[model samples]
Each structure stands twice: as structure tokens, then as C-alpha cells.
Target chain A: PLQIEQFERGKTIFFPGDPAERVYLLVKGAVKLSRVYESGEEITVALLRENSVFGVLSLLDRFYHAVAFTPVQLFSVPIEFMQKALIERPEANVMLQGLSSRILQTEMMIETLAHRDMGSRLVSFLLILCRDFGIPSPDGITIDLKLSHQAIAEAIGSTRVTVTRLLGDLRESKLIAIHKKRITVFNPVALSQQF
Target chain B: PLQIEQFERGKTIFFPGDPAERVYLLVKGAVKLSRVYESGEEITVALLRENSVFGVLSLLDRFYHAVAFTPVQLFSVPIEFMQKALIERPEANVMLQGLSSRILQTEMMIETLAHRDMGSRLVSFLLILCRDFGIPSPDGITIDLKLSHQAIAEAIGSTRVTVTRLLGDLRESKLIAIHKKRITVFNPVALSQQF
Candidate 1:
């Protein structure tokens, strides 16, 4: 059965150990898929926007605790249905493209986290968000998503206060501008050199 | 055209900017895929042993510099041939499985690199290698592949001498044993708590 569901911001959509027979596609707004390590730290592994496809195609992918990052709508389809849909070459091609894109995204996230310190990590993550979710502005590229300091912190393994302060430093340095929880990087070179 | 090729240990198989038309499968021994970042430092992105499928299925995957970690044999086939081969249901399923497994592998590598300290990074990476490439013995699980201290260092973003020294410490504490350059973790509990 194919179903569409809506969730309010801050609502947890699905958690670890939940039944995962259905693959999910984000139809509107954003979702965050996070994981908690044995060390008791929660990491925001993915910030999903519209059109992002997730869920079990089988294997060890069911561990994520998914939550609504914004008011969101999603399409849930059975995995078997999708498998059957893949009988067509074009459908299979699209799925392969999606999977390939996902590998690059995850690999880039790894490179972002490979930065040594908090500032470096934050900046690198911001740069990636800029590339993936950016909208071109007259002055700079604005990250199209609105994320709280805490969300940013979780994504980069830093505290909210540290993220706030580091963001202030970037603002003061005239490297970035923040308005209504959105970030615009004005000088990417200066920002990249900050760490 | 499909071909099988052999390379001696310490050989550089391919560099960034090379032809991307071929898909490669490791038939025997080991290969390393590394990337040098803009910071002038290199990171070992993947360690490939027998049965590992790699090379371009398309997109930004061609930036890696592949090297022979040991004397290696590989099957190289044109990407078009593989794409045609994938028209069959079972072949496509296998490729999809390979892609999904790759995402998890890369994600696990990200988690391993998220550790703050060098010791933690090393231990976490070793733990992962143990899980993925380990061979069971009466004492403990031994990593099936042979890797040099420098190779380990590059994988964990540390110095060769530092890896050398830390490995010595692990040996002293009976957390791991290195014989003939193959590492066996005798006490995984102590090893996990090392950092």
C-alpha cells in the first residue's frame, strides 16, 4: 500500500527498531535521520529535504531515528512494490542514480567530519550544505533550509553554544550572514580559511 | 574489452584524471583507493581486497588514486558491458546489494573517523577492519589483510611513527598482536576501551 503522511516540526516520524518494510520519499519540507552511538552521543546523519528517498532496501539501514526537521510530508511505499516497479529499465536507472548520489553525499559527509576541530568541522559542513541546498543570492549563496543551532551542533558533533559562538565569529568577520535561521556565506574563501 | 591484470606490491594502479570507462573487480590481494585533499594531505578512502567491486559506475568516483597494497589481480570490464549485464534481474539485484553495502561501509568509516583522539581513531578503524576483514582464530579475530604502518597511518590520518608506537602499546597491553604485519586483536574489550 502506498501512503502519504504529514508530520509537524519536531515530531519523531520513525525510530530505531520500528518496522521498516516500506521505503520513504520526502514529498514536502524536511526530515532529519539521526543515530545514537554506544557512547550515548546522538549524531544527525542526514538532513533530508523534498524528494529525498530513504528506508530499507534491505540490510543494516534500519537503525536511524527519523524526525521532522520541518513540517513534512512523505510518501511510503512497500519495498516489494518498488522492487516490482524496477522491472522497467528506466525505473531501475532512476533508482541506481539515486543510490549513487547517496553514496557521494555520505562520502562527502565523511570528509566533512574528518576535519580535526569543531570550527573546521562546522565550516566544512556548512560548505557542504551550501553546495547541496544552496540558493543563489545577489550577495551570496543562502542555504535554503532553516536549521536551529542545536540541529547544526548535532550535525557537526559540537555543542549548541559553540555553534552559536562560532557562527557569531563568522558573522562578525563578514564571512556569512544569518537571517531567520538561514545562513548565507558571503565569502567562501575567507570562511574556508577561518579554520 | 575485458581483461585481467596483475600488479606488483607497492604499484600505483591508477591516478586521478585517468579513464573512467572501466569497472574493476579485485580478484586477489589488496588495493587502496586514496584521495588527496586541497590541504595537501592524503587520506586512504578504501582498502579493497579480493571480491571487491570498484571503479566507475559513473559520477565523481574517479578522483581516487588506486594503489596496490599487495601483489594484486583485478578484472577490468567496460562500464557499458556491466550496464548491459545488469539488465538481468539477478545481476541488477547483486549490483544494488553491492551499492547498499558500500553506503554502510562508508558510513561506518565516517563513524570511525569521528573519534577525537588518534588512539580512538586507530582503535575504531581496527575494530571496523576486524568486523569486515577479520579471520577467526582460537585467540581472537585477526584482520585478514596485511597493511603497513604507513598505510594504517594514512587510513586513520596519523603519522607512521605514531602508528608504530601505538601498535607497540597495544601489543604490550595484550590488546592486539602483530605477527608478520598481520594484526590480531586478542582483547577487543580492552582495545575498544583504549581511547
Candidate 2:
């Protein structure tokens, strides 16, 4: 049951509490994992890029809501297929590394939210996007995505209005330049120095 | 080669960038995984209870740096053994669930950090400890260990001073009581409702 499924932007593959039936391995594009709070606020859990696996992998039952953050493509490998891989590899090295790295990335995100203010979080997140999904340009390195304030807000656990103000602040500081919703990093080193 | 190793509290098993070698399964006691920032600050990533696995499971190179938060006893399962299990029992259900659940828990923590405030984060973290590591008492639910202000600070990504003051706030509000280093939760429902 492993087939490459092509999906357009904004497609929600599943919601929190959906049955954990399959696993998704991203071939390309972005997937935004998020959850809605009681106040109806959406929070971004992880912004995943290529080669990242989403959906159910291990046997945990709780589920998180997932949305296609951008035009996406992934392989929906049924759980049993991964089961067989584990049963045979016994030395499933990369799989273990993948989980550990995932743990580290999540912890890093937690550290950002726990320690940094909203503006600093934005800069750190921007630097992450630059490192993972950036494309170089004459102006600087561009994030290569059309990022709205709402998307940015969800990603960093802030509000769209707050993100708007922060982006303006960042622009005024000459740290970043946003044109037509595409972000270009003017000084990534300085951006990371926010911490 | 799976051998149980005993370690005293606060012993570091691995550091960030340490060679990914073996996997540690906590047999008893607590382990805190943290990272040091470029600014030389320490931040806690995850505090694992018994039966939780640490160290490298996959073949990734970067390390998460684990410390025995309490007097710890763990089974050092060679990575090769885990790899062997993956190859057999193609239906290795528990193993899959473990990885999936681990991934999900990390994402949930990210959600909390991204959306919740410091106060809310502390409350949420307390409730988690109560549920995961707490011991029910006649007075209330106690978090089953001698956790200092510094450890709590590392767990929630706040400073010890902030954690101390916030615990006082929780006490003032009749939500929790701290006798020595152990914390007792008086009103868990109200605590979770902070969000």
C-alpha cells in the first residue's frame, strides 16, 4: 500500500484523533503539522520538508492534525510495510537517526518558544527556513516560499497581527526584506545573533 | 549486546556531536536530555521516565546530550540488536508504536511551547509530570522526585528565578504546594485550564 500520492497546497491529510492507519514519507514539498487550541488558535508543531516522514510511524495512537503547507507529494506507505522493514533490518540505523533528529528539532523549537520573545522566534525560524529551504539570490538568500503573516504566526506561536508588526520591525532593522510574500534574508548571521 | 548499566544522578551519557553509538533504555529513574546554546546557556529538551529510550536509535551523527536527571539504571541495548528486531517479526507492532508515540509527544511539546505562555507552560508541564511521574498522595498528587528550581527551569525553558517565582504564584493561587523539593498538585483541572 505504498503509493506516491500527489497533493496540491492546503490539503489536510488528517486531523488530530484520526485513526493511525498509515505513514507518509515526503518526496518533495512542505507539510505543516499543527493543532487548534480551545480558543480556536492554530499553532504550528513542525514545518517539514523533503525526506521527512509524517503520519503514523511508531505504534502511538494519538494523532495530530496535518495540512499541506505547500504544493506537496509524498508516499503513503501503509504501516505494515514499515513494520516489515523494521523486522528485517534489525539494524535500522537511518530510521533511528531520523527519530533522534526529529526529537532534536522539536526540542530546538521548544527552546525557541520557551526562551525567546516573538521577534527573536521569527528570526530564528527564518534562519531555519533559510538553512533548510532557502535559495540563494543576489540580494541574499531567499526563503523560496510565499509566506503569509498568518502562516508565519502559526509557525512560531504568535498572532498574525503580532507577526505583521514584528516583520515590519525586522524589515526596518534591515535584517530581512519581504517582497510579494517571499522573504529574503539580508543577514542570516546577524539574524541568529538575536539569541 | 544489551547490558544494564548503573549511573549516579547527573551523569552525562552523551553530548551533542558525540559519536552516535548505543541506545539507552531507562530501566529506572529519570533522564533529562538538553542542549547547550551558542551563548553557553543550557536548555532541557525532554525529561524521560522509565522505559523511555534515549541516545541514538537511528544512524544519525548529531547527538542530543543526555544526563541522568536522577540516580539512573538503564539497559544499554546495542544498536545492532535493535536493527535485528526490525528485520524479524515484520509485524513489529510495539516498536512502531514506540517510534510513532515518541514523535507525537515531541510534536505535542512543540505545540505547548509555541502557543502557551510561561505561566501556562509551567502549569501544563506540572500536570504532565503529575500524570506521567506523579504519585497520588492524601495531600494531593506529588511529582515523585526531588526536582529543584533549576531542573524545572531547564524543563520549561525558563530561568530558575522565574520558576521559583511562578511556583510561588501557583502556591498563592492554591494550585500547588511545594514541600522541600517535591511538588504536590492541589488543583490539576484548574492547572490544565490555564491555557
Candidate 3:
């Protein structure tokens, strides 16, 4: 059995170096995982939505390596319970599949940062965000998250100036619209063509 | 049971979009996994060394997302065997731990590129190379690969000029030594201090 809990927006559910005594299952809301560099720069690494699992990395070494951002509704299960369940339940293969998918996603992101041009990276980022987090609309995919260009730059490994210029270029071409922190992908084929 | 095989240098064990039918255990030599972009830019995602596991992600999903670089000595096991072995053997947990560690390493690299400066990212990349694949000598950790400065820049999300300057800076400070196609970390503590 697991216990569910909720936190207000902007609450810190966990920080770096915390003991890995439990694993978390998100039941509601979103949680951002990030780490702060020694120079005080913070990079958001992942955003977990409802039904997503996190804290698995810590389970291997008994310590968390990053901080959690955003308000999170999480179900916490003791590490021992989770470990036993992994051994006993055939359905645990689903969790393994999810973790494997996450690994592939992370690897792809690394490859993108390494090889893809800034414009293509931004386009890919937008496409992935639209696929994973956007709500469908009549015109296009509507991204409901309040992500700034700066945050997107961090996520895609680009400078704010570069991201701004690229976004401006996209807007000029009428591929995407950015208004009041909302983004609508009006041209999927065009965006896909950019890649 | 698993079957072992060897390949020559520059041979690809698998290509992108290939049906992933087996998991591989590297008994000797190195292997680089990479994905080619639509623009024909190939980005190296991982370099697996001796005793490391490759193809776990694709094995779990039954699809290969990247191609393998470098000659490899692989012990191949079918997914069915892997699934049963994971349940029947405690040693399988060790492989899962390695997978988790690799995922964490990729995530950390993403964070480093997102927030750290070029010099720090280079230093971190060097440290990773030393930790994972370096051949330790009496003087320092000697890198065995013949990676160009441009490749280093590409790996860490920087320009070749920046990599050249940073490497020169590190050499002048006696933190590292560079020869023709070789890099030696003379003072790891000093090198890590920059990060």
C-alpha cells in the first residue's frame, strides 16, 4: 500500500542528497526535477505529470541527486515495499517499460543537444512538448504550460537570445504563435519540415 | 543462455530502426551508440566499455533507436531469456542498477549542458571520460581514444575554438596535458575544482 499527499504550488518535495527511502508516483499535478549548479544556475531536467513515476534513480544508490520543482501530488511507497513488489509482481514489467522509455528519451535529448542545430532542437522540443503535454484544440495543439523562452532555452541547451531569435523567426513564418505564455502549433507539417 | 561474438573496428552491430531482438553484454572492446539526424549529423549518445550492457532500452521496447559504433565483443541474450532471468536471478538487479546509473549520467549531462559554461562542461566531460574509460597511468588518467578537439566540442555542446582555448587554458595551468590525439588529466583535483 502507498500513501498519497499533495503540496501547494512552488513547494519543494525533495532536495539533493535526501535519503532514498521511498519512490513516488504522481497522482495529480506536475512536478519538475532540477538541479542547481554551484554558480547558482538551475536547470529543469524533467517534468512528471499524473501517473508518472520518479525517484527510481535514488533507489539504486539510496540518495537523490536533484531537487524537485513545482507543486506535486505524489504517492510515496517505502523502498523495501517497492523492491519486494518488483520481485513478486509480473505487472512490474510495466514499470520497467516506463523506465526504459524514459532512458531512451533522456538519451535522445542528449544527442539532440550534442548534434542538432539550435533551430531544429527548438522545433523538436516544441513537437515533443505538444505531443506530451499539449491539449488538443481546433486549430492546433495548445500548450497549456506557462513555460518561458528562457526555460525552453535551458531545456533545449541554447542561449536565451538564440531561442528568442529562433522563436521570432518561427513566428514570422507563421508556424507557431506565442501569446500570454501560451503556444499554439498552427503548422504541424511546417514544423515537422524544419526537422 | 547467451552467445558471444566479436566484431572488427568500425563495424555496426545494429542500425537504427532495426528490430531489437537481443540484449548485449560487452565482454571486451568499446562500443559507441549514435543516432543520425535528418540533416545527416550523427551524434554519439553513449560509449560502452568492457563489462557494460548495451541494447537494454531497445530490448525492452523491441525497437532500436540508434546505431552502434566501434568494434564490440557482445554476449547476446533474447528478450524472453532476459525476462525470465531477471525474475530468476538476483544478479539481474545489478544490471538494472547499471541501467539506472547510465540514465542518471545522461540526465546529469543534460543538466551540465543546460546550465554550465563551456569550460566547465568540457571539464565535466573529461572527468566522465576519466571515470568511465580512461587508462590510468603513473602520471595521470590517460584517455585512450583518438578524439579530436572538434569531437570534444561537439560532445559537450561548444565550438571547436572554445574547446581549443579551454584545453590550452587547462594545459597552461598544469591541470591537463595534451599530445597528438591523446589527453591526460595531470591534476584531477584541480580540473574538478573548475567545475
Candidate 4:
């Protein structure tokens, strides 16, 4: 009951107040969901990767503005159809796992962003990145993607300059290293203890 | 497959790293879930009311410290049983609605707390409270529960003194009124535009 669609980079998938009639599953590339505040400031809420499920529940109004982080392919299923399949199909367990994983990841993000200081915000962001996107190397556990400071800023509600400055501080402290915009946490445990 | 249980006020329901084998449905009273940072500072993530669900997924480790905000009654069901019921029973839709509502609420909280300033945080918190716990009256729409400054402080990661000061500012601007610890927003539309 899923149909595939493609969106170009910078394309809008949905906006706040849109009808949430369908759920989306990312198949290729990245998608970012953001919330726009009354002051016109937009904050990135979830930056999703492949296999990530989003917009999975039907709500009265779509509360997030979802945009393509990169040109991407996604599968869309109607809310009613998806629910029926989830209850009637064997693959239901697999889908539930993905749904549960997304919730857990978002919950972790909430906890990370709850810290007051910017340093703590960035450090917590790095540690969560290490958990989701890290690969162990001889040097340390490095986040796999090349992240622009602007992307980092929107995720944690900071400015690009601030992210760059904090990254510099982290490098100087030897808590983390950045090479070609890829961050490597030297010791996550130690880094976590920083704030 | 649900079992009733009771917890006294301030009782610990679960701690971080505890087994998340069971999901709970609050039947009476309130509960709060918090996250403890590596620095040993704990932040409140959610203050749940009755009918709210918690610990709904099976995770390798519980990431929240849950406690009874007030003496509470709850129904507990093992994760497997709950999942099975969702897949095999008619009440699944009702359960899914509750689960989705919780996610939406938490996501709203994330957006509210993402604001950098204390005033914005408190304003957003009040708006969300107005959505969830507000009741319209001849005077204004008042948040139903009596809230302490300390509770507001913990919810927004600010000090009680800061919440008291900003709340005073809101009151002076005709944005809100506090009577016996109950807050009433004079005009939610105007308050939303304040930021």
C-alpha cells in the first residue's frame, strides 16, 4: 500500500496546517522536519536518514514543515491503510520497531537540548550523533557525515558562528576533532562529562 | 492483560537504565519523567497527567527517571502483551491515538524549550499549557492546575527566581494574571505575538 515519490534538494514535503493524511518512509537521502515559531524563527526538530519513518500518525493539523535535506526518495502510505497493514500484516513488527526507534531518538534529542548552555548543547549533540551516525576508527568514534556548521546550528537552535566557535573550543579541549567537517569524539564518556 | 498498581506521591516509578519491559497507563493523578545529564543535573522532560501513557516501548535501557508527581494509580501491561493487543484487538486505534498524542505533546515541549531566552520559554510553556490544561472563563482562559514557580523552573530549565521575575513581567504587560498560583492568560492571541 506504499507508493514511492521523489523530491529534489530544498523541496518542501509538507507544511504546518497541511492535512496529515499519509505517513512517509524515507528510502534515500535525508529529510528535515522543522517547527516555525510565532516570531518566524524556524527550528529543525528531526533530521531523518534513510529507513526513518515520519508523519506516521494522523493529526488534526500538520505541526512540522518537512523539507528535503537532499534529493530523496520516499514511500507514502495513507494513514488508514498504514494502520490496517500494521494491525493485519506480519511486517507490522518491523514497522513498529522503526516507529519506536524514531520516538526513542527524538526523546533523546529532547533530553540533549534541555541543557541551558550552548557548550552543553553542542556536546550533547555530538554524543547523540556518535550514537546514531558514528563509526569507530583508530583515532576515535567519528560521525559519518560531513556536517556544515549551519546545519548544526539549526538542529540545536544556535547560530552558525556559535557552532564554529564551540567546535573550536571542543577541538582545543581535545574532547573532539573535526576533519573536513566530520566530527570525531575522542572519548564520548569524557566528552559527556564536560557539562 | 493489564494489572493495576498504585504509587505514592514522590515515589520513584523507574530510573534511567531500568528495564522498560512494561508500558504504563496513568489512571489517576500525575507523573513526571526526567533525564539526568552526565554532570548529575536532572531536567524534567514531561509532566504527565492522568490518561497519559509512559514507558510504551522496549528499549535496551530506560533513558528516563519517572516518578509520581502525585499519588497515582496506573495500569501496567507487558510490552509484548501491549503490542499483541494493538495488532490483534479492536481497541488498538484508541491506544494508538493516546500514543500519538503523547508524541505530539513531547514534540511541542521540545519546540517550546528550544527557545534560548527565559521569557520565550515561559511564554511557549504557557501557550502549550493553555492548549492542554486551559479552561475558558469570564476573566480569561486559566490553566487548570495550580503551578509552583519551582515546577515552572524545572520544566523550562530556569531558576525559580527567573520564572517569578518573568511571570511578573507578563502580568505587568497584561499578558497574564496569577491568582493563588493559577495563571490566566488575558489574551492568548496577543501573548503568542509577544515574542
Which candidate has the highest lDDT of all?
Answer: 4
Best by TM-score: 1
For model 2, residues A1-195, the per-residue Cα lDDT tens digits are 346787776778777767767778778777877655443545666777787776644343434667877778887866777766666764544565565555655555666665457877887778768877899898889998887788777778778999999889988988789999899998787677664
DockQ of each: 0.48, 0.44, 0.38, 0.41
B45-164 per-residue lDDT for model 2 (tens digits): 666777676664444444466887777888876577666755664443455456555655565565545544678777766765776678878877888878778776777777899988
Full ranking by TM-score = 1, 2, 4, 3
Poorly placed runs, candidate 3 (over 4 Å): A1-4, A35-42, A61-72, A87-91, A111-123, A148-173, B1-4, B36-41, B61-72, B83-92, B111-122, B135-138, B144-175, B179-181
lDDT of 1 by residue, B3-55 (tens): 68989877888777677777877888767776655545466666665667777
> Considering just chain B, what TM-score does every model have?
0.80, 0.83, 0.69, 0.78
Candidate 2 chain A, run of 10 with poorest lDDT = A55-64
* Kept native contacts, fraction for each prediction: 0.40, 0.50, 0.38, 0.28
Which tens-of-lDDT digit does each residue in B40-83 have in candidate 3?
Answer: 55555555656667777655633333223334567788767776
For candidate 4, lDDT tens digit of each residue in B1-195? 436898875678988877777888888766777766556767666667777888875531666788876568898877777767666755344555666666666677777777778898899888877876789977789987667787678778889999999999998888789989889998888778765
Docking class of 1: acceptable
For every candidate, C-alpha RMSD to the true structure in Å: 3.1, 3.5, 4.4, 3.7
Q: Lowest lDDT 10-mer window, candidate 2 chain B?
A: B54-63
DockQ of 1: 0.48
